[PDB]
Design a protein around this nucleic acid. Sequence first.
RNA 1: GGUACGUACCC
RNA 2: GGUACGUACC
Length: 653
Amino acid sequence: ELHGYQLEAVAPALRGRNSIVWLPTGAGKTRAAVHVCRRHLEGRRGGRVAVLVNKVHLVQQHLEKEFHVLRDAFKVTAVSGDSSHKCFFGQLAKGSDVVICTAQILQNALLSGEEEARVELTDFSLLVIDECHHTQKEAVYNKIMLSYLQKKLSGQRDLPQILGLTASPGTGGETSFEGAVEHILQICANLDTEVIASAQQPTKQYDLCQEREQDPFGQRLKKIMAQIQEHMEMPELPQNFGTQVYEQRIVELENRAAERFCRKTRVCALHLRRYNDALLINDTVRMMDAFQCLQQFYADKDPTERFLATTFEENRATLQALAGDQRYENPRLSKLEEILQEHFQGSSRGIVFTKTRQSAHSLLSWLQDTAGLCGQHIRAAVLTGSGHSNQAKGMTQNEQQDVITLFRYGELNLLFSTSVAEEGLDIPECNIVVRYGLMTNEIAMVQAQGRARAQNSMYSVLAKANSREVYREQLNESLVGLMERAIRAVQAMPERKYRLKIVELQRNAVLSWQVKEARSSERRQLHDPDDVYFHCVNCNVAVCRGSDIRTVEAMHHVNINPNFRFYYTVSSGKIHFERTFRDWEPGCRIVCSECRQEWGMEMIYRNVTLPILSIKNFVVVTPDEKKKYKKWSTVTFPIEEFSYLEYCSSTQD
RNA sequence: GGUACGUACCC
RNA sequence: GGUACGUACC
Ligand SMILES: Nc1ncnc2c1ncn2[C@@H]1O[C@H](COP(=O)(O)OP(=O)(O)O)[C@@H](O)[C@H]1O
Ligand code: ALF
Ligand SMILES: [Mg+2]
Ligand SMILES: [Zn+2]
């Protein structure tokens, strides 16, 4: 059953050594890990395995395709975010021999204050960490492993054996041999690795496209942007319309205008960001997709707003007409059409990877409206993860699974997917991967290519000629080789030198964490919460103090002041999510009573309703400065945990 | 919707 | 120090 190379790769794990199994994409690391799990559980009494993954869909895949075979002798349980609300994790885990979950499910249990929810690392004898190259920086995998290292270095006994699985440790952005080796050693230190274990036809093509000869739609948007910038009456405004740098600079101006309460500048900047978004969409997909971006924004008075509405209305019909003209088609789409026409003339089974969820939806719509493809028997669908925004909702575990199951045997034969499916997904019949204008690291490149499991697969890079994306793809190909050299060098290192380096790196990691925690705490304690005032980002009115805020589940920032209700208005009916939570559900959206700016949403927490505030909708004012924050975790005053008991007691008075 | 982190980009 | 996107958790 197991191939020779699978047996070879797991020999250290079978002996109890912490290891990383480094085998190519599609080589069968999962089955190898199942064998380790079986022998681990057979080889002692009372063992318990946790299998950690990084994407929701991989929980069911690993269970149904691989780990379920253990149920002839052992209890195997799977948990994701979608199923979380039903059982206490600690109960479920402790009743199982093997638990399979996304890593943050385990992390939440490790951090829990509730006896029934909580688990310790010492409740497991083996941790299998899939896609273990993510065990870096402040990713969840590394939060879990840093706690392991803190416990190890303090002398804790009974920590689990570690089995990491990866095709691609990467080079961590390093382009030198010295740097790449250091990166490999860092990953080994993070995972407490004793040995990196390894073993002892697809074609790649660059499908390059040219810039559009004529782009009257884009040209008109740039003309409008210039008009809006003239209206702002400001020198030194950015001119580089239709770029990520422009986006950054205009949002930075928007944030500065919020902090200084310059309403006209802030609103103009907010609109300019939408025109820039439209230019980026126009470059990626169809003109009409870009038009719909702007039309939706203006469909959803003040002199600045009147100017901006009029400006759009004056150009709307010309823009829509241009967007219907085939003469100005996006060459990226012309190229994609050529690829699909060549390869889907039922035979093929493909994934086209795009950056954004909205792009994936737009590509499906394009496909469905393209005469030249209607006739090739293409049955396509979008696959995204559970990310969400106003631009684009996500997909639930169940929705993702439906698409995946139909794609597996060809009920669907083409997916437009985000990076949700770049790693781990196993579709043996997938024989084509197109990467549509992506800028990624070498890991994502190797992984996404690897979704084409079939013999005689093809991998297409569809990107603009002479672009940074093409340069980065070429560089990344070289970095894969560099990575391989570096891993072999680490594998060949004298044991004494390796062990000493690992020691050094683990020590550095645990010391560096302490210093970071101290710095974060110092920042958090700078101001008394009574001295911090929140202002509406839109109208600048004061609305509460820092002392009014509490956290729920260390995430949701509620205002507990009984008179805050006079400052916000309930602005919708009840919100519904797909996922249900243990102690609360959403109520309605809330907005500033003075200007209708979105602020957050109600939480119905047991028998009370509390308003949750989104940090991005405020300017935070302290005695020292006024600042727009993107994250609650960096504010300069302390916030206490919500106490439901204390809250109910104080309200009864 | 809320939160965090990763990747890309700029400083 | 920021921007965008993505995923994950809630
Ligand atoms: N020894 C084997 N014989 C036949 N098929 C195998 C063997 N080991 C694994 N497989 C299959 O190989 C495919 C790729 O395995 P997977 O574990 O997803 O690869 P990866 O190493 O990227 O995790 C799966 O369909 C799996 O069932
Ligand atoms: F390396 Al894989 F699925 F784990 F392609
Ligand atoms: Mg895998
Ligand atoms: Zn307001």
